């Protein structure tokens, strides 16, 4: 492999519009329902094939959710007078992150299957976010997702999806396969940066390669603030901005890795495909789709990730190339696809870039008045962008949480 890395440079920062109409989510209603009074989810990881295809099976959809549950009775989450405290509820679950399924005929109205793995078969507590990938006519899923402290490890564990006529459950799951750290020469470890970023595998088999890949997320190697900004992360930046302040922390990349064979049993690590030094500490959840022969690259990230004197919103961003390894450009010259608007500007995060054109998201917060804000946990609206060489458009908008499947399978 004898590629080099597309950059993310502070001049395609610069480009970033907040609430182009085009690339603007819609705002959240906030009398917007919720999916279930008993938990919590947000990052949503519909089943897919190898190809990137949303996969039903026996006419059921099926989505992977990260999950928690609901301390609505719990003393521990109460405000002062023993009142109900939703908000640090909520925000207290990526400490409790586990990983459950959902069901539905219909992509929509989605009916809670519980949970994947049974409570102390992932090696660390924390199940965070990764991939579900259907293997087989007779339903094996290899659930790629990363195990969280101590550390941080992507890893896979198999198992069975059996579905009756009313309802689904899943068989295994219960050996998890560590597969790969952060090396420390191409990917930044624990060591080098105790704030460390690595997580999110989706793997995906190459048309023109036919070889086994997977993105996730992940920093340039070297010690914490050892980067420097070169005249490349800068990018080709207008007069009066050359000053970066602390860029040097800032140091996100969407990372390539490559099995061995298809059983993806054994994983090399590759160089990064994107990397955003001085402009970007966090490239999460990165996925393809593949369109009109280009792969279209899509990474979320967060408005205050954004290195100094740069901004954009939360949202997903992207990039577009001919070829795997690059070189890509930014979607829309600045690679911002899909931003929340500066009204309610964390409204929805984790959006998810479906073949389709379809797009998922969580409900986060939505702003009433003031200070105080609703908390969701709940699937948003569903959008459809279309995409058109390195430029996207919004282009409507469906029901919450709809996800319906591109693709049947029958067992
Ligand atoms: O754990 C901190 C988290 O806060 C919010 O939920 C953000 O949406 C999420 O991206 C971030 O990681
Ligand atoms: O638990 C949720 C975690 O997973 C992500 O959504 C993607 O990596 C991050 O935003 C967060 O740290």
Excluded at 149 to 167: E, L, M
Excluded at 209 to 233: C, W
Aim: hydrophobic letters at 35%; charged letters at 20%.
């Amino acid at each position: 492999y004898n590629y080099k890395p597309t950059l993310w440079t502070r001049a395609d920062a610069l480009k970033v519009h907040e609430d182009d109409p085009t690339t603007t989510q819609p705002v959240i209603d906030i009398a917007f329902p919720v999916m279930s009074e008993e938990v919590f989810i947000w990052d949503t990881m519909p089943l897919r094939d190898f190809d990137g295809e949303i996969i039903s099976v026996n006419g059921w959809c099926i989505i992977f959710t990260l999950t928690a549950d609901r301390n609505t009775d719990n003393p521990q989450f109460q405000d002062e007078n023993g009142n109900y405290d939703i908000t640090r509820d909520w925000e207290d679950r990526h400490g409790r992150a586990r990983i459950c399924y959902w069901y539905s005929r219909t992509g929509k109205d989605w009916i809670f299957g519980g949970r994947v793995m049974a409570e102390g078969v992932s090696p660390t507590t924390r199940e965070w976010a990764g991939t579900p990938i259907l293997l087989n006519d007779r339903g094996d899923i290899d659930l790629y997702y990363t195990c969280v402290t101590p550390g941080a490890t992507i890893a896979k564990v198999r198992g069975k999806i059996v579905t009756s006529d009313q309802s689904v459950s899943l068989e295994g799951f219960q050996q998890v396969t560590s597969l790969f750290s952060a090396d420390g020469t191409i990917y930044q470890t624990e060591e080098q940066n105790a704030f460390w970023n690595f997580r999110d595998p989706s793997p995906f088999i190459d048309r023109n390669d036919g070889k086994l890949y997977m993105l996730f997320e992940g920093n340039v190697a070297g010690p914490r603030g050892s980067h420097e900004i070169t005249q490349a992360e800068m990018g080709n930046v207008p007069p009066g901005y050359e000053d970066v302040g602390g860029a040097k922390y800032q140091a996100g990349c969407v990372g390539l890795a490559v099995a061995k064979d298809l059983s993806g049993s054994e994983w090399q690590i590759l160089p990064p495909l994107i990397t955003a030094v001085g402009v970007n500490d966090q490239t999460e959840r990165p996925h393809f789709v593949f369109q009109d022969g280009k792969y279209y690259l899509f990474t979320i990230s967060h408005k205050y990730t954004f290195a100094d004197n740069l901004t954009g919103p939360d949202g997903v961003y992207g990039f577009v190339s001919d070829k795997l390894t690059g070189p890509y450009t930014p979607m829309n010259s600045s690679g911002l696809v899909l931003g929340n608007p500066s009204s309610q500007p964390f409204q929805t995060y984790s959006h998810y870039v479906m073949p389709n054109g379809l797009v998922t998201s969580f409900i986060d917060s939505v702003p009433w008045k003031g200070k105080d804000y609703r908390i969701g946990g709940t699937e948003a609206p569903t959008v459809k962008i279309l995409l058109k060489g390195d430029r996207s458009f919004i282009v409507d908008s469906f029901d919450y949480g709809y996800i319906p499947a591109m693709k049947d399978i029958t067992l």
